[PDB]
Design an enzyme around this catalytic site. Structure first.
Site, PDB file in Angstrom:
ATOM      1  N   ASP A 104     148.474  95.855  47.653  1.00  0.00           N
ATOM      2  CA  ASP A 104     148.790  94.748  46.748  1.00  0.00           C
ATOM      3  C   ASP A 104     150.293  94.462  46.698  1.00  0.00           C
ATOM      4  O   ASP A 104     150.698  93.298  46.595  1.00  0.00           O
ATOM      5  CB  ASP A 104     148.307  95.059  45.321  1.00  0.00           C
ATOM      6  CG  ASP A 104     146.871  94.588  45.015  1.00  0.00           C
ATOM      7  OD1 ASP A 104     146.090  94.206  45.906  1.00  0.00           O
ATOM      8  OD2 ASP A 104     146.505  94.621  43.807  1.00  0.00           O
ATOM      9  N   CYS A 161     146.345  84.355  55.392  1.00  0.00           N
ATOM     10  CA  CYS A 161     146.458  85.274  54.266  1.00  0.00           C
ATOM     11  C   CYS A 161     146.354  84.416  53.006  1.00  0.00           C
ATOM     12  O   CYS A 161     145.504  83.520  52.965  1.00  0.00           O
ATOM     13  CB  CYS A 161     147.733  86.119  54.384  1.00  0.00           C
ATOM     14  SG  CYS A 161     149.283  85.209  54.795  1.00  0.00           S
ATOM     15  N   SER A 162     147.174  84.621  51.965  1.00  0.00           N
ATOM     16  CA  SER A 162     147.093  83.666  50.856  1.00  0.00           C
ATOM     17  C   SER A 162     147.877  82.377  51.150  1.00  0.00           C
ATOM     18  O   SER A 162     147.300  81.286  51.118  1.00  0.00           O
ATOM     19  CB  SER A 162     147.551  84.320  49.550  1.00  0.00           C
ATOM     20  OG  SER A 162     147.202  83.459  48.447  1.00  0.00           O
ATOM     21  N   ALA A 163     149.176  82.481  51.517  1.00  0.00           N
ATOM     22  CA  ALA A 163     149.957  81.286  51.862  1.00  0.00           C
ATOM     23  C   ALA A 163     149.966  80.951  53.352  1.00  0.00           C
ATOM     24  O   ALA A 163     150.308  79.824  53.726  1.00  0.00           O
ATOM     25  CB  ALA A 163     151.414  81.444  51.389  1.00  0.00           C
ATOM     26  N   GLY A 164     149.568  81.896  54.186  1.00  0.00           N
ATOM     27  CA  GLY A 164     149.580  81.689  55.628  1.00  0.00           C
ATOM     28  C   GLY A 164     150.952  81.759  56.291  1.00  0.00           C
ATOM     29  O   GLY A 164     151.144  81.124  57.345  1.00  0.00           O
ATOM     30  N   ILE A 165     151.886  82.533  55.734  1.00  0.00           N
ATOM     31  CA  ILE A 165     153.224  82.684  56.327  1.00  0.00           C
ATOM     32  C   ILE A 165     153.708  84.123  56.390  1.00  0.00           C
ATOM     33  O   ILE A 165     154.490  84.472  57.283  1.00  0.00           O
ATOM     34  CB  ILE A 165     154.270  81.795  55.608  1.00  0.00           C
ATOM     35  CG1 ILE A 165     154.404  82.170  54.128  1.00  0.00           C
ATOM     36  CG2 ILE A 165     153.913  80.334  55.771  1.00  0.00           C
ATOM     37  CD1 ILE A 165     155.531  81.384  53.389  1.00  0.00           C
ATOM     38  N   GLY A 166     153.270  84.992  55.477  1.00  0.00           N
ATOM     39  CA  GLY A 166     153.824  86.337  55.428  1.00  0.00           C
ATOM     40  C   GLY A 166     153.117  87.364  56.294  1.00  0.00           C
ATOM     41  O   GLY A 166     153.558  87.635  57.416  1.00  0.00           O
ATOM     42  N   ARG A 167     152.022  87.949  55.788  1.00  0.00           N
ATOM     43  CA  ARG A 167     151.173  88.790  56.638  1.00  0.00           C
ATOM     44  C   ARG A 167     150.766  88.066  57.921  1.00  0.00           C
ATOM     45  O   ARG A 167     150.717  88.676  59.000  1.00  0.00           O
ATOM     46  CB  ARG A 167     149.919  89.235  55.875  1.00  0.00           C
ATOM     47  CG  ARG A 167     150.234  90.089  54.657  1.00  0.00           C
ATOM     48  CD  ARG A 167     149.005  90.390  53.818  1.00  0.00           C
ATOM     49  NE  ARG A 167     149.400  90.770  52.467  1.00  0.00           N
ATOM     50  CZ  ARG A 167     148.537  91.018  51.485  1.00  0.00           C
ATOM     51  NH1 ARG A 167     147.234  90.908  51.703  1.00  0.00           N
ATOM     52  NH2 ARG A 167     148.983  91.356  50.276  1.00  0.00           N
ATOM     53  N   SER A 168     150.409  86.783  57.809  1.00  0.00           N
ATOM     54  CA  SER A 168     149.988  86.004  58.989  1.00  0.00           C
ATOM     55  C   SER A 168     151.102  85.927  60.027  1.00  0.00           C
ATOM     56  O   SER A 168     150.848  85.986  61.245  1.00  0.00           O
ATOM     57  CB  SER A 168     149.592  84.585  58.571  1.00  0.00           C
ATOM     58  OG  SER A 168     148.371  84.539  57.823  1.00  0.00           O
ATOM     59  N   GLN A 182     158.055  86.814  54.930  1.00  0.00           N
ATOM     60  CA  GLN A 182     158.456  86.398  53.577  1.00  0.00           C
ATOM     61  C   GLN A 182     159.478  87.310  52.911  1.00  0.00           C
ATOM     62  O   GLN A 182     160.085  86.896  51.903  1.00  0.00           O
ATOM     63  CB  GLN A 182     157.227  86.342  52.654  1.00  0.00           C
ATOM     64  CG  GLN A 182     156.357  85.147  52.828  1.00  0.00           C
ATOM     65  CD  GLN A 182     155.124  85.200  51.918  1.00  0.00           C
ATOM     66  OE1 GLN A 182     154.235  86.051  52.073  1.00  0.00           O
ATOM     67  NE2 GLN A 182     155.089  84.318  50.951  1.00  0.00           N
TER      68      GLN A 182
END
Ligand code: 02S
Length: 284
Positions: free
Chosen positions: A181, A215-222, A262
């Site tokens: 998390d 992912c949630s925003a599509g920029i960090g983990r992705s 991010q």
């Protein structure tokens, strides 16, 4: 500089925040006018994460062709990816329309539906074989075929049917279920194992449309997923693998979608993943 020793030099000097801020300063800025039209407000999860106009995926619809999704096309590596936000209640039908129209084989999900006690994306696939989903706005049917639950990730086989033409296709859902998390994983080993499972399935290969990753925003983990994949492919293709510059690859990818990676911790984790991954590809 090489990667592994640049890495220890940033650790010893504690300058990850300064390196990451340099990337943010040098990153491309292109217009995202379609994303900001008033009619698209309920199609965006976050007001500060938008696709650039020049690289956005268009839905094959004449009313409204907008989805928060970008085509990342890596010319030297010969890989393409679609990066998108986690679907919203009013965009789950658009999401599967895109998967269909772009001829994707696989969907890569890097978040849980609930994290930190809040919803991070809609429940957009069926959880039981006998309870299929119908998306009436885009005329698609989605059925769970099988599910394999492992300790760090789950793989699902799904059937997507275009109800207009009765054509069907098999989609693979690769769900990484253990990203914490807060922060990043302590070791990259399970993330790399997951990447290799996606590769082995054919979902990243040129005989299919681009993989869809979110992912949630599509920029960090992705961003971490496609950055690690592309860097490892370039290390295999080039005569001199130590010439691969992860900061330059990241800036190239940021020509196609804003904000990839991010935090400075995600940047350090991406270095760690590429470094460890390069030893397994060959042996240390
Ligand atoms: O010396 C270095 O700086 C270096 C050497 C080899 C290297 O290759 C790693 C690799 C990755 C994937 C497939 C094959 C090799 C990367 C960096």
């Amino acid at each position: 500089m090489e990667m592994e020793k640049e890495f220890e030099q940033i650790d010893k000097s504690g300058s990850w925040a300064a390196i990451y801020q340099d990337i943010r300063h040098e990153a491309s800025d292109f217009p995202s006018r379609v994303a900001k039209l008033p009619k698209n407000k309920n199609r965006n999860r976050y007001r500060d994460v938008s696709p650039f106009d020049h690289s956005r995926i268009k839905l094959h619809q004449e009313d409204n062709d907008y989805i928060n999704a970008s085509l990342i096309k890596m010319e030297e590596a010969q890989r393409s990816y679609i990066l998108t936000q986690g679907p919203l209640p009013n965009t789950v039908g658009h999401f599967w329309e895109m998967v269909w129209e772009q001829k994707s084989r696989g969907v890569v999900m890097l978040n849980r539906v609930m994290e930190k006690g809040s919803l991070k994306c809609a429940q957009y696939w069926p959880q039981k074989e006998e309870k299929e989903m119908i998306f009436e706005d885009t005329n698609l049917k989605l059925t769970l075929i099988s599910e394999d639950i492992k300790s760090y990730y789950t793989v699902r086989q799904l059937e997507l049917e275009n109800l207009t033409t009765q054509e069907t296709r098999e989609i693979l859902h690769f769900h990484y279920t253990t990203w914490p998390d807060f922060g990043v994983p302590e070791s990259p080993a399970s993330f790399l194992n997951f990447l290799f499972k996606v590769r082995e399935s054919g979902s990243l290969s040129p005989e299919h449309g681009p993989v869809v990753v979110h992912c949630s925003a599509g920029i960090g983990r992705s961003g971490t997923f496609c950055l690690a994949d592309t860097c490892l492919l370039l290390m295999d293709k080039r005569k001199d693998p130590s010439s691969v510059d992860i900061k330059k690859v990241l800036l190239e990818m940021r020509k196609f979608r804003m904000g990839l990676i991010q935090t400075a911790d995600q940047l350090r984790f991406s270095y760690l993943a590429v470094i460890e991954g390069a030893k397994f590809i060959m042996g240390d």
